[PDB]
Design a protein around this nucleic acid. Structure first.
Lengths: 246, 69, 116, 248, 194, 53, 159
RNA sequence: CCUUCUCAAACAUUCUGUUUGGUAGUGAGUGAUACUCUUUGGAGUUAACUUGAAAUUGCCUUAAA
């Protein structure tokens, strides 16, 4: 386990480096780079490790996207069974009770007929930020929503359990979407050794809370993976050695 | 020599306002339904689901009657 | 003037040298065909060259396929000027001793915050 | 005759689905048989039934040997079958469309059954459908007068039954039906004795009604047969009994 | 002092500069009192809390609601050149004029009491930069929206008919009807320029 | 002269949803389908409030 | 001898482009008299006991099309060459060229009639489209402008 | 003128949780310092952005006639 105090000396000296006399991303993007003796080297996965986080950075990301130029929007990809079954009003009635809001639910059909053009698909996908996807069709998507949409960590979808033991229920999705939203952070898995965790918005993450997020991630990485070196980095800063495995 | 048409046009040739009839869903069909509502209110017309039920009882009872006595 | 090598461009996704050789055999005897692919992954950059042995037969094809709409997007095709041969479109497909240096590199790296 | 450029790409891209489709299945059941589950989709045998409101009762498959009758269908549109499916359809000699055969379903048979699923339709038949198939269609490749055997002609007799098989107790054509409906030991010999069943095609013509009945029935295949294209695609079973009324 | 932009994205740039700047008392100056019906009606319907001042409304209706801005802290009003003349609030920092003003000569004189920029394709202070791929992609949202309500279609129309009349009824030799109408319709987002 | 059954039932939907916010009522899409003005909707509601509450 | 505005027809759209035009246009059939009637009886049976967006179709009246070009609302316009009074449609390719609306002379008037629930149509146009076929429509616009317009720029000349 | 892997398991149930496994891409181009590796050959990687589906060459048969 890592000390809390090196991370505090890591984050606040980057608060120094961000307080200097593109800028929407360079100042704002807290990311942390993780190295391994060969992450998943031989197979090109696209899963997102949903790292459990104590305090959300998405309800944070909810606000500052209204003050900044780009609207943070949430997608749900469903199969055919549910879209004929469920409306946004049922989602809105049981998620605004928190205050989270699904903007658009999209069938598997709609990815292949009404956004099949590469131009319109890039126009459709690049708007959204939280791409969620129901599990039945999660495994069909890189034919559907393109390869360009999997270059990011936003636009790559998240598999989410919507079936209450083999049958769909709305109750199952409604508390699970909150589970991914406020408690979870994605990170992808390249078959390289380098991996970053784009932790999020530097305008948010009051840096005592931010250290709580960083240390909790380092728990779920060292247990799940062998690791070599860990670095925190505001976007192309000097890299800061936080943890040093051998 | 395609002389006048080489200078390609910009605004349409009119300036007429476009009516509200080209937006909210159309009166004509809405009037026509209301008449077919009226006729089934008077019962001149059967709905198509019961016409299958008129054809379900019918058309199986075929060749099922006495012809000599 | 015009020469024998052709510039078939704007090719549909899923249309390779074989089908390029097969379909353009229909016009006559065809010299040699490639298609330009990405080196890293064996997929096409959607423009390719072929040559007929008859310089007559080339501009037959160009006057038949210059704007020929083909499953999504029309093929743009070009005869070429004299010389300027087909060249180089290879058929690509989908292709504690350390601990000494990392102990060196962990200590070297701390100088950088002191640098800035 | 001349080939339009529309064709050769559509044929390319459809088979290069099937070249990708069976590759994944051939990798999977390799890892199912060799038992190296670290990353698989599913870990068991799936057989789904589609009958009638359009029910989809997915089932498991135990080791219990069952009897399947398989009809060759001509699907899909632009698919030159690859080498891996030329073989199975030739080993079942289902190379003619609208031709059927009974086979036995084991756990040796089921993995190869996921190969040919888009090219045929399968299912469990009934005894009536067992019986009314054979005594109404039946070919026997047997010697003619002296030279010409391959007149396959007809299950005319019960003493031709004495002739070729005979010594396995195979005495009459009704006795053959005992060897198929019940898994007998000489089941494969009598299965090798009745080589096709030349079923008729349903639409069977051009014309006024025939164009329409073709169109109305062609969409009916698109509901009663779905093409899963999945790694752990189920094997889809239809009712044979209602199908043979359409085919006899 | 100014921002050089083409007529397509003039409005689209403005919606960017409003959303990024949502804390400051800022004023836009537009020409027609008919027009700021339009740009007010969008922004309350694409959900920016804007304010609206124009000749086509009553006096104390104009005044008491203008009074709300003057005692405010955060928001934004849209007004004409004419109705805001003589009544400058010192509590302001951004004066962005979208149009060439009514009097171009006497316009500089009304500054000096408030930072300024304008918008011009062919037509003291400096300019600003703009990174071109940052403008909001609401034109997809708007074109559906300009076709769906007819009230918003009518007010788009009057916001266009009255925009160009005022553009012709102006002083300067520069600002005289050279501009192509394919792109000013896109500032109000049409397929065809009415 | 009275109002039709559909018209009355449609006005019930509008009144229970908004109340007396005619601006919201005409910018509404789901209930007010035919994009009628403020003056049209309020007039018909006044007639509705005479026969009913 | 033919005066250039006549025999601006007969230099029609070719085999493959015409096939692809109908591949688009046959998607956008007007709802036929029988289909429309049964839909309204479905509406009668449903709405009397216990929402829809504007549906796209081809536009097919000569007056309606001559309205739509110069409105401007038309995107693609198909024009039959065989017309009993030819003078009915001779101005129409020039009108499209002047207003900048992409047009194509199709071959066969009954061929237009098939897609439109009529005997003959003389002119057919597609004003608006569903989102999925938008890119396909605009591609066909470029396909027609390359094949029809750019090849026959000299169609305004030569007797 | 083809139309694309629409869920498997395990444990625990509250009317669904927990856990594991399953996804091999249109192309081109720009580009922010870092990570590993072996060996100077470059390999695998790590923000972000552009683009009409763009482009001028890296060594089976009745879907018959």
């Amino acid at each position: 386990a890592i000390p809390r105090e090196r991370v505090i000396k890591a984050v606040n000296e980057l608060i120094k480096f961000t307080s200097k006399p593109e800028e929407e991303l360079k100042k704002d993007l807290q990311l942390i780079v993780v190295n391994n003796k060969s992450f998943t080297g031989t197979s090109k996965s696209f899963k997102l490790k949903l790292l459990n986080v104590k305090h959300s950075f998405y309800k944070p990301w909810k606000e500052a996207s209204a003050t900044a130029v780009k609207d943070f929007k949430v997608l749900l990809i469903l199969k055919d069974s549910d879209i004929k079954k469920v409306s946004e009003d049922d989602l809105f009635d049981q998620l605004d009770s928190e205050g989270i809001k699904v903007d658009e639910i999209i069938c598997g059909k709609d990815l292949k007929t009404v956004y099949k053009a590469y131009e319109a698909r890039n126009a459709f996908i690049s708007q959204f930020s939280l791409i969620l996807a129901d599990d039945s069709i999660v495994t069909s998507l890189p034919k559907l929503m393109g390869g360009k949409a999997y270059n990011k960590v936003e636009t790559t979808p998240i598999s989410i359990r919507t079936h209450a033991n083999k049958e769909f229920s709305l109750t199952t999705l409604t508390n699970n979407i909150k589970k991914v939203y406020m408690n979870q952070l994605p990170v992808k898995l390249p078959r390289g050794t380098t991996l970053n965790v784009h932790l999020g918005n530097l305008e948010w993450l009051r840096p005592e809370e931010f250290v709580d997020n960083v240390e909790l991630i380092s728990e779920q990485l060292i247990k799940a993976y062998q690791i070599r070196s860990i670095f925190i980095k505001t976007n192309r800063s000097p890299v800061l050695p936080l943890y040093y495995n051998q | 020599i395609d002389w006048f048409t080489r200078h390609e046009e910009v605004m349409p040739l009119t300036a007429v306002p476009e009516p509200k009839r080209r937006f909210v869903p159309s009166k004509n069909e809405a009037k026509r339904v209301m008449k077919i509502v009226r006729a089934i209110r008077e019962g001149r017309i059967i709905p198509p689901k019961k016409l299958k039920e008129m054809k379900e009882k019918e058309k199986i009872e075929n060749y099922q009657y006495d012809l000599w006595g | 003037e015009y020469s024998g090598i052709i510039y078939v461009s704007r090719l549909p996704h899923g249309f390779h040298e074989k089908e390029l050789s097969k379909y353009f055999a229909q016009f006559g005897d065809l010299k040699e065909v490639r298609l330009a692919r990405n080196k890293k992954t064996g997929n096409s950059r959607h423009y390719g060259f072929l040559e007929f042995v008859n310089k007559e037969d080339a501009m037959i094809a160009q006057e038949s396929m210059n704007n020929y709409l083909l499953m999504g997007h029309l093929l743009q095709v070009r005869v070429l000027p004299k010389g300027a041969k087909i060249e180089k479109l290879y058929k690509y497909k989908k292709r504690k001793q350390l601990k000494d240096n990392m102990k060196q590199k962990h200590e070297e790296r701390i100088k950088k915050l002191a640098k800035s | 005759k001349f080939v339009r450029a529309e064709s050769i790409v559509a044929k390319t891209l459809a088979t290069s689905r099937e070249k990708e489709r069976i590759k994944r299945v051939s990798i999977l059941e390799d890892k199912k048989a060799k038992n190296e589950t670290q990353h698989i989709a599913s870990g068991k045998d799936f057989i789904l039934k589609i009958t009638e409101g359009l029910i989809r009762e997915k089932t498991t498959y135990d080791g219990k040997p069952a009897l399947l009758f398989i009809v060759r269908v001509r699907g899909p549109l632009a698919v030159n079958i690859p080498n891996k499916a030329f073989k199975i359809l030739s080993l079942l000699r289902l190379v003619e469309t609208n031709t059927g055969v009974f086979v036995k379903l084991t756990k040796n048979v089921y993995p190869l059954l996921k190969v040919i699923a888009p090219y045929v339709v399968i299912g469990k038949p009934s005894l009536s459908s067992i019986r009314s198939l054979i005594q109404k269609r039946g070919r026997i490749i047997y010697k003619g007068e002296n030279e010409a055997e391959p007149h396959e002609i007809v299950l005319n007799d019960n003493n031709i039954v004495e002739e070729q098989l005979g010594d396995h107790g195979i005495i009459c054509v009704e006795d053959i039906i005992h060897e198929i409906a019940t898994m007998g030991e000489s089941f494969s010999v009598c299965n090798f004795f009745l080589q096709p069943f030349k079923l008729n095609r349903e639409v069977s013509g051009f014309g006024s009604l025939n164009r329409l009945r073709k169109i109305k029935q062609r969409e009916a295949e698109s509901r009663t047969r779905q093409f899963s294209n999945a790694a752990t695609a189920p094997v889809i079973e239809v009712d044979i009994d209602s199908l043979l009324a359409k085919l006899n | 002092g100014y921002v050089v932009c083409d007529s397509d994205k003039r409005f689209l740039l403005l919606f960017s500069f409003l959303k990024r700047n949502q804390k400051k008392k800022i004023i836009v100056f537009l020409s027609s009192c008919n027009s700021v019906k339009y740009y007010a009606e969008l922004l309350n319907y694409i959900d920016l809390p804007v304010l609206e001042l124009h000749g086509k409304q009553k006096q104390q209706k104009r005044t008491n609601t203008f009074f709300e801005f003057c005692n405010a802290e955060r928001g934004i009003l849209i007004c004409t050149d004419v109705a805001a003349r003589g009544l400058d609030i010192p509590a302001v920092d951004w004066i962005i004029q979208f149009d060439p003003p009514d009097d171009p000569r006497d316009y500089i004189h009304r500054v000096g009491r408030g930072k300024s920029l304008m918008f011009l394709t062919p037509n003291p202070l400096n300019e600003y930069e703009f990174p071109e791929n940052k403008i909001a992609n609401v034109q997809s949202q708007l074109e559906k929206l300009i076709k769906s309500n007819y009230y918003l279609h009518q007010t788009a129309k009057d916001g266009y008919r009255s925009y160009l009349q005022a553009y012709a009824s102006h002083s300067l030799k520069t600002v005289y009807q050279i501009d192509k109408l394919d792109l000013a319709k896109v500032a109000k987002s049409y397929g065809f320029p009415v | 002269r009275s109002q039709s059954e559909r018209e009355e039932e449609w006005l019930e939907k509008l009144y229970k949803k908004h109340g007396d916010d005619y601006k919201k009522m005409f910018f509404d899409k789901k209930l007010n389908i035919y994009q009628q003005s403020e003056g049209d909707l309020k007039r018909r509601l006044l007639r509705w409030k005479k026969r009913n509450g | 001898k033919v005066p250039p505005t006549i025999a601006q027809f007969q230099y029609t759209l070719d085999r493959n482009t015409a096939a692809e035009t109908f591949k688009l246009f046959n998607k956008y059939r007007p709802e036929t008299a029988a289909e429309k009637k049964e839909r309204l009886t479905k509406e009668a049976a449903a709405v009397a006991e216990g929402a829809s967006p504007k549906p796209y179709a081809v536009k097919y009246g000569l007056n309606h099309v001559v309205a739509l070009i110069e409105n401007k609302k038309a995107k693609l316009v198909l024009i039959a060459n065989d017309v009993d009074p030819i003078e009915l449609v001779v101005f129409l390719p020039a009108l499209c060229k002047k207003m900048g609306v992409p047009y194509a002379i199709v071959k066969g008037k009954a061929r237009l009639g098939t897609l439109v629930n009529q005997k003959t149509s003389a002119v057919a146009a597609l004003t608006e489209v569903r989102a999925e076929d938008e890119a396909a429509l605009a591609k066909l616009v470029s396909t027609i402008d390359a094949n029809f317009a750019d090849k026959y720029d000299e169609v305004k000349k030569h007797w």
